[PDB]
Design a protein around this nucleic acid. Structure first.
Ligand SMILES: [Mg+2]
Ligand SMILES: [Mg+2]
Ligand SMILES: [Mg+2]
Ligand SMILES: [Mg+2]
Ligand SMILES: [Mg+2]
Ligand SMILES: [Mg+2]
Ligand SMILES: [Mg+2]
Ligand SMILES: [Mg+2]
Ligand SMILES: [Mg+2]
Ligand SMILES: [Mg+2]
Ligand SMILES: [Mg+2]
Ligand SMILES: [Mg+2]
Ligand SMILES: [Mg+2]
Ligand SMILES: [Mg+2]
Ligand SMILES: [Mg+2]
Ligand SMILES: [Mg+2]
Ligand SMILES: [Mg+2]
Ligand SMILES: [Mg+2]
Ligand SMILES: [Mg+2]
Ligand SMILES: [Mg+2]
Ligand SMILES: [Mg+2]
Ligand SMILES: [Mg+2]
Ligand SMILES: [Mg+2]
Ligand SMILES: [Mg+2]
Ligand SMILES: [Mg+2]
Ligand SMILES: [Mg+2]
Ligand SMILES: [Mg+2]
Ligand SMILES: [Mg+2]
Ligand SMILES: [Mg+2]
Ligand SMILES: [Mg+2]
Ligand SMILES: [Mg+2]
Ligand SMILES: [Mg+2]
Ligand SMILES: [Mg+2]
Ligand SMILES: [Mg+2]
Ligand SMILES: [Mg+2]
Ligand SMILES: [Mg+2]
Ligand SMILES: [Mg+2]
Ligand SMILES: [Mg+2]
Ligand SMILES: [Mg+2]
Ligand SMILES: [Mg+2]
Ligand SMILES: [Mg+2]
Ligand SMILES: [Mg+2]
Ligand SMILES: [Mg+2]
Ligand SMILES: [Mg+2]
Ligand SMILES: [Mg+2]
Ligand SMILES: [Mg+2]
Ligand SMILES: [Mg+2]
Ligand SMILES: [Mg+2]
Ligand SMILES: [Mg+2]
Ligand SMILES: [Mg+2]
Ligand SMILES: [Mg+2]
Ligand SMILES: [Mg+2]
Ligand SMILES: [Mg+2]
Ligand SMILES: [Mg+2]
Ligand SMILES: [Mg+2]
Ligand SMILES: [Mg+2]
Ligand SMILES: [Mg+2]
Ligand SMILES: [Mg+2]
Ligand SMILES: [Mg+2]
Ligand SMILES: [Mg+2]
Ligand SMILES: [Mg+2]
Ligand SMILES: [Mg+2]
Ligand SMILES: [Mg+2]
Ligand SMILES: [Mg+2]
Ligand SMILES: [Mg+2]
Ligand SMILES: [Mg+2]
Ligand SMILES: [Mg+2]
Ligand SMILES: [Mg+2]
Ligand SMILES: [Mg+2]
Ligand SMILES: [Mg+2]
Ligand SMILES: [Mg+2]
Ligand SMILES: [Mg+2]
Ligand SMILES: [Mg+2]
Ligand SMILES: [Mg+2]
Ligand SMILES: [Mg+2]
Ligand SMILES: [Mg+2]
Ligand SMILES: [Mg+2]
Length: 56
RNA sequence: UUUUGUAUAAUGGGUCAGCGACUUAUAUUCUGUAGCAAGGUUAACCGAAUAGGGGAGCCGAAGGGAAACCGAGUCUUAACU
RNA sequence: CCGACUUACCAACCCGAUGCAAACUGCGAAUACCGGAGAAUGUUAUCACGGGAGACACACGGCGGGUGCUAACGUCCGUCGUGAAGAGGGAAACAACCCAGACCGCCAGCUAAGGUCCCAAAGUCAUGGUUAAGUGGGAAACGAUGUGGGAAGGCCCAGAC
RNA sequence: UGUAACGGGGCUAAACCAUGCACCGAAGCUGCGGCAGCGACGCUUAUGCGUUGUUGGGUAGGGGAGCGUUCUGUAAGCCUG
RNA sequence: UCCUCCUAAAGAGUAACGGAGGAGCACGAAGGUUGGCUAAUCCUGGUCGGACAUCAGGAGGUUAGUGCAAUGGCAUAAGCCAGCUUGACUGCGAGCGUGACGGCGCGAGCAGGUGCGAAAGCAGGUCAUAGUGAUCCGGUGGUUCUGAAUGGAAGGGCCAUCGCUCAACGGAUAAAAGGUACUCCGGGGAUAACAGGCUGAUACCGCCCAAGAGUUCAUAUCGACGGCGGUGUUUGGCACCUCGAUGUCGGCUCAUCACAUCCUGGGGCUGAAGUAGGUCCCAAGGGUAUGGCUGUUCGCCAUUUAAAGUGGUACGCGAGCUG
RNA sequence: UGCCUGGCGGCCGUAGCGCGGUGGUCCCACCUGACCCCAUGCCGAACUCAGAAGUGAAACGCCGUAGCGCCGAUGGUAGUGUGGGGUCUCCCCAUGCGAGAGUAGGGAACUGCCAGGCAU
């Protein structure tokens, strides 16, 4: 279980960068989401690391 | 208004008041609603007459094949699992 | 005839070394594309049918290219973003650049881009060096004892310069 | 055409390359109140009585719900010197 | 109109008046099967015989060949020869690929009847990708499907098939050229010329090395073979503003700004003895001609001037004039 | 159980070339002859038949040799997906992927089944 938050917009981003946020459940700026720790979530975090921040 | 793009030095209007631009008939398809239901429904017309009669007639319940023709099967081909 | 020779010259095949090619690959990625399984999330976001449209004049920016002068806010193709159809802050002004997607109201607070001397809201903030040209605040080949450094080298107290 | 290649004043830093701590800075995010749609759930529906999550920029265009005027029936009713 | 490669950004596809080439056929064998075989080139030797015909070996290993243009493939050969034959058959077709669609292509396998091979097996056209044209209309053959009172038939219908460089090749008609400055309408700055805008291939100007010319000596003064920049001044590229009008070349009057200055002013070098000169730097305060020719700016000539500038202002200025 | 040989395979160069030796009990190859089965665009050269006198010369199988071919590291370089930048017809930073060429080096194949001859 890890905590993720979004800190940047998804306006000029790629479709694969917005679908990643859709999969992570992020809705807007500063949306705190709890997600299970798994290689899939880690890969998503690596993919959108420039706009997300983890609390661990 | 037209444009990728108008404060544009692209067009329109001096202002006010009145008038002014997806309507009508018939025919077909679709949606909702209402009656009836494997049936539904009349037109012309008669009728003192929005009643009633008139089911002539139209759609659908059975389709296949060009057509004869056959039939919940048919055509295709001498014959097709 | 046959030829004996060298000779201000050029040069085939092969060998050794150095390169080039969108229409050359004995080599060969990253990305992208097809399919399967799996956890999580997304208002089925997917497909099929039926009713109704609108549109087929796009532009700019990034990356990958052709034609141009490796010129054009030039033109032609692929991908993404924006405008078109998107308000707001910033770049002094600015359709396409950056941040960021306006349900409404509040004389509440927190931030991103971008800034904190005044216009104009915020540090005349602290330590550390550079610049003396208003460089900052438009530009090249090239030239110069301009300085701020780093690493070496020659000559040199029998005397260098 | 008139400074006119920092926006201007002005700056020997208020310029640049390096470190850090603060602040300003948007319709971005958080706080309060209010409206509407979709979907889950028990409302045994009153089709709404609480929840909860989410969404609500918008041209052409599509869908849905509505306001206003004339006349007609309700209406020999009602208001009105 | 159709075929091959690249551009085409390693799935497919993907444009330009982009770069390179082809097709509008041919074959009863150049098809199928069975059986067998492997060259291009070079070297050596040998009669006519030569660099190269034919014959022997050796090296080489597809560097040849594909009926054709290119690409992808071909040794089990798809290449090269011989024999036998017509599967260059009929009716079907699981399941796919590609297209907006019409449509096109690959196809295991089924029923009948064949060819080759002893047989297993192969053959529903050529190694593959171009060799092509919707519909209507009309013709031919066959067809027991129809046959307008009945029996026939004409005609029509199903199958095979024929006729179109419809080449503008998804084809508007069975058949079709030009002028308008006598002109006209709806429209476009979606699209033309002057002008304005972006860039600067061209134009002008500036700068760098120095081979040299310069009686010796590169740089008093010029400057090759080459290179780097500036103005947006010419001829030009794009077509972003304007076609429900921004009036255009030249001339007259009227000027203004700039300096890469024609004179005046000051200076450096000089292959500057002096006058008179050449080159370069600063400097825009002022001035900067009259006539013949031509509509002309430009330009030629005559004669002056201390000098008779370069360019911008919508190639300045027509709600100032001229035509 | 070993050695050698033949056939059918697996993989397709660390598997292939070249140099030097070895092998004939058996197998294999070379080899003898041909009216016949059969054939040569002529020819027992090839195919095929009847045989084993002779030979391991050639081919073939085996052995060792690095004159070639071949494989091939680690590290580094180019390139590149995503996000930021600069002096932007070209590069840099952060995080992942990571070549090719070349060097050191490896390397004279391995193996399955069915058969034949000699030892056991
Ligand atoms: Mg956990
Ligand atoms: Mg326009
Ligand atoms: Mg504006
Ligand atoms: Mg317009
Ligand atoms: Mg206007
Ligand atoms: Mg107009
Ligand atoms: Mg007007
Ligand atoms: Mg109805
Ligand atoms: Mg019927
Ligand atoms: Mg059936
Ligand atoms: Mg290439
Ligand atoms: Mg997938
Ligand atoms: Mg069109
Ligand atoms: Mg178009
Ligand atoms: Mg376009
Ligand atoms: Mg454009
Ligand atoms: Mg580009
Ligand atoms: Mg351009
Ligand atoms: Mg602009
Ligand atoms: Mg254009
Ligand atoms: Mg539009
Ligand atoms: Mg905006
Ligand atoms: Mg948007
Ligand atoms: Mg703004
Ligand atoms: Mg600006
Ligand atoms: Mg502003
Ligand atoms: Mg704050
Ligand atoms: Mg900040
Ligand atoms: Mg202040
Ligand atoms: Mg201070
Ligand atoms: Mg001035
Ligand atoms: Mg605010
Ligand atoms: Mg908000
Ligand atoms: Mg609230
Ligand atoms: Mg809305
Ligand atoms: Mg919103
Ligand atoms: Mg009434
Ligand atoms: Mg491709
Ligand atoms: Mg691709
Ligand atoms: Mg053939
Ligand atoms: Mg054969
Ligand atoms: Mg000869
Ligand atoms: Mg060829
Ligand atoms: Mg053949
Ligand atoms: Mg059969
Ligand atoms: Mg037979
Ligand atoms: Mg062919
Ligand atoms: Mg016709
Ligand atoms: Mg008759
Ligand atoms: Mg009959
Ligand atoms: Mg015809
Ligand atoms: Mg066509
Ligand atoms: Mg007109
Ligand atoms: Mg235009
Ligand atoms: Mg023009
Ligand atoms: Mg204009
Ligand atoms: Mg000389
Ligand atoms: Mg021009
Ligand atoms: Mg005009
Ligand atoms: Mg006008
Ligand atoms: Mg005019
Ligand atoms: Mg001067
Ligand atoms: Mg002055
Ligand atoms: Mg004075
Ligand atoms: Mg005279
Ligand atoms: Mg003029
Ligand atoms: Mg004039
Ligand atoms: Mg005027
Ligand atoms: Mg005249
Ligand atoms: Mg023997
Ligand atoms: Mg023999
Ligand atoms: Mg031997
Ligand atoms: Mg490596
Ligand atoms: Mg990048
Ligand atoms: Mg390597
Ligand atoms: Mg290597
Ligand atoms: Mg060997």
């Amino acid at each position: 279980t890890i905590k993720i938050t979004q800190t940047r917009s998804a306006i000029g981003r790629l479709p694969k960068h917005k679908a990643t946020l859709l999969g992570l459940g992020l809705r807007r700026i500063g949306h705190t989401v709890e997600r299970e720790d798994t290689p899939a979530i880690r890969g998503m975090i690596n993919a959108v690391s420039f706009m997300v921040k983890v609390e661990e």
